[PDB]
Design a protein around this ligand. Structure first.
Ligand SMILES: [Co+2]
Ligand SMILES: [Co+2]
Ligand SMILES: [Fe+3]
Ligand SMILES: [Fe+3]
Lengths: 275, 275
C-alpha cells in the first residue's frame, strides 16, 4: 500500500549539553571541563499514502543561514546548519516527483527552527500542530522575539502564506490521519507541545517517529538522559517512557529525532523507501 | 521577641552549569567551551523563638568528605565541601549556647546532601519535610543508591537515630510553626519537594528563606535562569515567581540558598543576629 521516505535535510552542530544535559560535569581535577560541538542529522519523512501524502517535519528554511539569513547571528553560531541544495526539502521532494501542493497533511512535531523551517511551502496542506506549541510560537512572534529556536521570519511567512492549521488540543486523543498513520499527542516536554507519528507499514511493520521527544539512543537509554533544551522535564520523562511502552506493545521501531548512527543506517530517498 | 542567626557551615564548589543550566554554550568559534568550578556558601538559619527554637536546614555531615567519608568519591569530587571545625553546625550552635536537644523544629528545605547532613543530631525535634522529598530519598535508600545528592549513610543515620518526622502533604497549606514563622510548601522544582520559611521579624521585617528554590540572584533575575540540578522545570519556574509575588506583597527580603555575594553581606552568628 504505502511508501515511506527518509529525506536527508542536512546536518546541524550544537553543544552536547543541549543534547545530553550535564554530559561531562566539572570536577576538582577538571574544574574547567570542556564540552563538544556535536553534529546531528536533520531529516523529514514522507508517507506516500493512497489516502494522501503525509509529511512529518519540514527541516530548516533555505534562507536560514548566512548574512541575509532569517536566523539571528547568535542562533547561526550556536546551532549552525550545513546543507547542500540537494538537502533542501523542496529538492528532496522534487527528486521524488512530489510538489508541495501534493501534500495533504503536514505534521509538525514541534515548531523549532529545524523542524518547521519549510511549513510555508505547504499552502494546500492541513498543518497539524500541538495547540500549546502553536500558541507558544505565536507569542514569540507577537513579542517580537528575534533570538531563540522560534524563527520570527519563519512564523511571519506562515501567516503571510495563509497556512491552514489543525491544532491538537492538550487533552486530545491520538488522531487517525490515515490507515496505519496515527498522530501521537506527546504533549509538553522538549517543547510546549510535541507530536509524534505511529506508522504501521505492511512489510516494515510499526514505526514511531519520536522527533525531539527523543534526541538519540543515548537519550533513550535506559536510563533516560534528558536534554538541555527542555521546557517540561517531567512531561519529557513521561513521554520517553510512554514511547518505550508503545514500542514494546506494538513491536514498533523508534526513530529518534537527531541520531547520527541510526540515520546512517536508514535507507534515504536517494536509495529507496519503506513499505 | 525572636533572634534569627545565620550560621556559616562552610563552602562548596561545583560546575556552574549545575547552578545556571547552559550558562556558556559552545559556538562555531568556541566549540569546546569551558565551564567554571564556582564556590558557594552552605548556611543554616536558627530562629531562637520564645515558642521554641526553629532550625532551617542542617548543612553537611562532619564525616561527609575524605577517604572514610559518607559521600561517595564521585560526589566528593563533583561537589567538594570545605569546612573548618568552627563551620560545623554542632559547633556553630555550641557557640550560641544551643544544644541539639534544644531544637523543637527542624525544617528541611529538601534532603540534598548539603541541607540534610546533620538531621541526625536533632533527636528531640520535629523534622518538617515535604512528603514527596521524604519518599524520594527513602527510595534512594531502599534501592541502595550510593551515588547522587541523597547520602545513603545520612539517611541510614536518620532511621537509626529514630527521628520524629512531620511530612508536609503535597497539597497542604502553609504551616504556622510559630508567631511570625510560616513553613512555605513550594512543592516540586529543584527537588521532589521544597519547603521555604517566611519569617516576620519585629525589627528586620519579612524574610523568605528560599533555599535551593532560588540558588542565586542570577537565578532570580528577572528573567529566571534555571539550574542544571532540577526535577520539575515547570514547578521550579512557578515557585520562583511565587516567591517574587510573596516578597512583593509582604515587602520581604529573599534569602537565596547559595549566593556568595548575598552571604557576604549577611550578619553571621559570630557577629550577631536579626530581630
Ligand atoms: Co527541538
Ligand atoms: Co539542593
Ligand atoms: Fe530538533
Ligand atoms: Fe543546596
Amino acid at each position: 500500500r504505502p511508501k515511506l521516505y527518509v529525506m536527508d535535510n542536512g546536518r546541524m552542530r550544537m553543544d552536547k549539553n543541549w543534547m545530553i544535559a550535564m554530559h561531562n560535569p566539572a570536577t576538582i581535577h577538571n574544574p574547567n571541563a570542556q564540552t563538544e560541538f556535536v553534529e546531528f542529522p536533520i531529516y523529514t519523512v514522507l508517507i506516500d499514502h493512497p489516502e494522501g501524502k503525509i509529511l512529518f517535519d519540514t527541516s530548516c528554511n533555505p534562507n536560514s543561514m548566512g548574512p541575509q539569513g532569517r536566523w539571528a547571528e547568535s542562533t547561526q553560531q550556536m546551532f549552525p546548519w550545513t546543507a547542500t541544495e540537494e538537502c533542501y526539502l523542496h529538492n528532496r521532494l522534487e527528486q521524488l516527483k512530489v510538489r508541495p501542493e501534493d501534500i495533504r497533511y503536514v505534521v509538525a512535531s514541534h515548531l523549532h527552527l529545524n523542524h518547521a523551517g519549510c511549513l510555508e511551502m505547504f499552502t494546500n496542506a492541513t498543518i497539524i500542530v500541538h495547540e500549546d506549541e502553536f500558541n507558544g510560537a505565536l507569542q514569540c512572534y507577537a513579542r517580537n522575539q528575534k533570538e531563540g529556536a522560534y524563527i520570527w521570519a519563519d512564523i511571519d511567512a506562515w501567516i503571510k502564506n495563509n497556512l491552514q492549521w489543525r491544532t491538537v488540543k492538550r487533552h486530545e486523543d491520538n488522531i487517525l490521519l490515515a490507515e496505519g498513520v496515527k498522530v501521537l499527542n506527546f504533549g509538553s516536554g522538549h517543547a510546549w507541545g510535541m507530536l509524534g507519528l505511529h506508522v504501521e507499514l505492511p512489510e516494515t511493520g510499526g514505526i514511531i517517529l519520536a522527533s525531539d521527544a527523543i534526541y538519540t539512543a543515548e537519550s533513550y537509554g535506559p536510563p533516560i538522559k534528558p536534554p538541555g533544551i527542555i521546557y517540561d522535564s517531567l512531561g519529557y520523562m513521561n513521554t520517553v517512557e510512554r514511547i518505550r511502552r508503545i514500542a514494546q506493545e506494538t513491536k514498533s521501531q523508534v526513530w529518534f529525532g537527531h541520531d547520527a548512527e541510526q540515520f546512517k543506517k536508514f535507507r534515504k530517498s536517494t536509495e529507496g523507501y519503506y513499505e
